[PDB]
Amino acid sequence: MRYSVVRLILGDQLNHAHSWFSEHRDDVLYLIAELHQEQEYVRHHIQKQCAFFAAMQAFADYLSAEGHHVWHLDLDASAQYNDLPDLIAQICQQVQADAFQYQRPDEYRLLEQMANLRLSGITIGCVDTEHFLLPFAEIPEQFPASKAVLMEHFYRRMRKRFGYLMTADGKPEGGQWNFDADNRNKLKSPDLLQLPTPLCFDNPVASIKARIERHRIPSIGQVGESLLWPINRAQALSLLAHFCQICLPNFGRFQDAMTAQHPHRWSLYHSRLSFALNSKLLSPREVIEATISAYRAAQGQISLAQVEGFVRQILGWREYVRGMYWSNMPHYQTRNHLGAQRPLPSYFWNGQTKMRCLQQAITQSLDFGYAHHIQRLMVTGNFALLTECDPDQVDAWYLGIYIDAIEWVELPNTRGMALFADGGLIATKPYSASGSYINKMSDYCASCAYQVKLKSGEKACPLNSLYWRFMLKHRDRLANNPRIGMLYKTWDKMTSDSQQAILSTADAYLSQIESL
Numbered sequence: 001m002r003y004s005v006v007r008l009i010l011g012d013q014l015n016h017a018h019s020w021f022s023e024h025r026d027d028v029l030y031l032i033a034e035l036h037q038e039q040e041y042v043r044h045h046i047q048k049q050c051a052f053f054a055a056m057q058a059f060a061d062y063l064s065a066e067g068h069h070v071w072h073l074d075l076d077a078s079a080q081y082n083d084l085p086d087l088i089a090q091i092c093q094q095v096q097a098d099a100f101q102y103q104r105p106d107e108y109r110l111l112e113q114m115a116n117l118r119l120s121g122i123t124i125g126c127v128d129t130e131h132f133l134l135p136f137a138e139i140p141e142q143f144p145a146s147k148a149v150l151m152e153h154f155y156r157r158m159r160k161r162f163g164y165l166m167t168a169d170g171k172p173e174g175g176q177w178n179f180d181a182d183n184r185n186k187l188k189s190p191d192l193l194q195l196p197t198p199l200c201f202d203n204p205v206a207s208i209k210a211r212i213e214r215h216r217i218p219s220i221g222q223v224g225e226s227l228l229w230p231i232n233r234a235q236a237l238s239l240l241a242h243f244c245q246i247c248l249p250n251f252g253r254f255q256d257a258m259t260a261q262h263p264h265r266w267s268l269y270h271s272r273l274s275f276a277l278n279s280k281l282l283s284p285r286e287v288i289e290a291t292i293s294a295y296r297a298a299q300g301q302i303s304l305a306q307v308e309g310f311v312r313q314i315l316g317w318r319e320y321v322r323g324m325y326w327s328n329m330p331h332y333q334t335r336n337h338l339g340a341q342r343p344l345p346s347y348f349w350n351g352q353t354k355m356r357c358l359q360q361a362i363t364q365s366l367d368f369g370y371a372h373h374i375q376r377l378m379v380t381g382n383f384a385l386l387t388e389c390d391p392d393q394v395d396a397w398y399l400g401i402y403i404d405a406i407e408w409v410e411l412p413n414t415r416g417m418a419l420f421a422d423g424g425l426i427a428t429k430p431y432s433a434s435g436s437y438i439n440k441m442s443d444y445c446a447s448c449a450y451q452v453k454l455k456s457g458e459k460a461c462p463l464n465s466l467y468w469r470f471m472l473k474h475r476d477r478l479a480n481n482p483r484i485g486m487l488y489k490t491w492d493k494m495t496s497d498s499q500q501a502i503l504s505t506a507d508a509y510l511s512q513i514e515s516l
């Protein structure tokens with residue numbers, strides 16, 4: 001018989017600056033819980049379970065130190081309840097609450113579950129997470145349903161609205177909006193010798209792993225005794241500072257680069273802030289502001305391309321995919337424009353493929369819970385696009401295996417940008433590529449069993465023929481765009497014999513897809 005108000009904090013709601021905490025109330029109880037149900041909607045990476053569980057406990061500790069009343073329920077405690085609604089209802093009854101409040105969730109499934117909660121004698125309210133730049137209530141106007149809103153136009157509007165990288169008279173700093181064309185370098189040997197050591201934390205996780213195991217919770221991937229990912233706001237801020245000082249000067253330059261050689265190949269110059277942002281340990285405003293401040297203080301050593309390249313991903317892509325998700329869900333999750341139905345190959349779960357590119361991206365995903373963007377898009381994403389993998393199966397892999405994956409951001413990037421299964425709603429054109437793209441941006445083909453210079457026959461890079469088979473299959477859909485039509489000239493110039501050898505090689509590789 002003890003609290004008037006119960007307030008839930010979900011595992012991705014770790015915003016230390018939330019207005020709830022701006023006052024101290026002895027009549028308010030905060031609840032944060034490890035939840036079996038949140039392990040059952042997809043099979044998560046063990047490192048993702050460890051990171052969220054560690055971060056939820058660390059946030060509870062922060063709140064308690066600040067004088068808030070907080071109960072953190074680990075799986076041993078939460079297993080007494082049937083699901084999250086039962087946990088809420090029983091605890092509200094236990095403490096004789098008059099009111100229950102929660103922060104709006106960031107997946108459709110959970111927003112719907114909480115919206116349908118009814119508690120006898122208890123008033124329920126839903127508040128914002130106080131994190132994203134675009135207010136949730138503006139999504140319907142900014143993102144009309146089933147409309148292919150152009151990310152670039154939304155990004156320019158966001159640049160003007162928030163003032164980031166804008167001139168005093170309202171123009172983009174540097175004479176253009178988007179510096180992506182300057183951000184397409186491959187790492188050469190001297191660049192590899194200069195790669196910085198990624199900032200890795202030492203967060204022990206043996207007890208968390210043992211608790212997960214005791215509850216027979218399924219997971220994918222691997223972890224040792226220590227988790228390298230930030231699990232509290234101080235570690236996240238330290239990663240942000242590391243990024244600004246050590247990585248931001250080359251972030252754009254090598255944004256699309258991949259290497260099989262260097263020990264730090266899994267991180268390169270990326271920020272690795274996505275988990276910290278998506279769990280709301282950091283806000284996008286503070287990350288943007290920190291990186292712009294570092295740029296301005298570097299007196300030319302951080303070029304504008306680096307910081308615009310970074311800001312575009314947070315102010316532009318991240319806010320954009322959120323808007324498109326909420327405007328188009330739940331129908332969006334049914335879209336399969338290209339009719340893709342192939343099973344995801346088994347080496348997505350173990351890395352046992354002879355394609356060096358796929359082997360590197362899958363193995364790092366399994367071993368780190370993380371792949372950088374060009375791997376997600378142009379290595380595993382392109383492969384799943386060209387081989388027509390079932391989007392439901394692809395979504396389950398991406399949403400589970402990456403520590404930063406929550407559906408609002410996974411689904412538009414995977415089903416939309418990578419698989420083109422929304423017919424271009426999210427990103428306009430398919431991101432299809434042959435092995436020539438991988439060879440241009442990476443050193444993978446120099447350490448591969450296949451020959452990237454061969455399109456057909458024995459030992460040819462499978463991407464080379466799978467690319468043409470895909471583009472020819474969809475020629476009528478895609479030839480209306482004029483720039484891609486050029487690609488069909490490269491094809492139409494080939495002999496009948498060569499065209500046929502390529503399509504025959506593609507079909508053979510698909511029939512043997514488990515062996516690639």
Ligand SMILES: Cc1cc2nc3c(=O)[nH]c(=O)nc-3n(C[C@H](O)[C@H](O)[C@H](O)COP(=O)(O)OP(=O)(O)OC[C@H]3O[C@@H](n4cnc5c(N)ncnc54)[C@H](O)[C@@H]3O)c2cc1C
Binds near residue numbers: 317
């Ligand atoms: C198929 C596919 C699936 C993806 N699934 C996810 C996912 O589940 N969660 C996720 O956060 N990102 C996802 N991304 C986007 C992007 O690849 C990751 O944000 C990025 O790899 C995270 O690494 P980082 O923090 O080092 O990013 P950096 O390269 O340092 O980029 C800076 C920040 O920009 C943001 N960002 C970059 N690209 C995007 C994007 N396309 N959409 C949204 N935010 C972006 C993130 O906040 C990131 O921390 C996906 C991309 C693809 C192509």
Ligand SMILES: Cc1nc2c(=O)[nH]c(=O)nc-2n(C[C@H](O)[C@H](O)[C@H](O)CO)c1C
Binds near residue numbers: 010011049106406407
């Ligand atoms: C692995 C995981 N575990 C939990 C948990 O046990 N409890 C919790 O409150 N949240 C967890 N999360 C985050 C949620 O599954 C879900 O993705 C977000 O709350 C959506 O906004 C995740 C991702």
Ligand code: SF4
Binds near residue numbers: 438439450451
């Ligand atoms: S040759 Fe083809 S399969 Fe091998 S690394 Fe290059 S792109 Fe990947």
Ligand SMILES: [Cl-]
Binds near residue numbers: 188189190
């Ligand atoms: Cl070189």
Ligand code: NA
Binds near residue numbers: 036037040082
């Ligand atoms: Na359940």
Ligand code: NA
Binds near residue numbers: 067068069070
């Ligand atoms: Na306390």
Ligand code: NA
Binds near residue numbers: 188189
């Ligand atoms: Na070279």
Ligand code: NA
Binds near residue numbers: 313317373
């Ligand atoms: Na991106």
Ligand code: NA
Binds near residue numbers: 109333407
């Ligand atoms: Na779903």
Ligand code: NA
Binds near residue numbers: 151152427428
């Ligand atoms: Na685009």
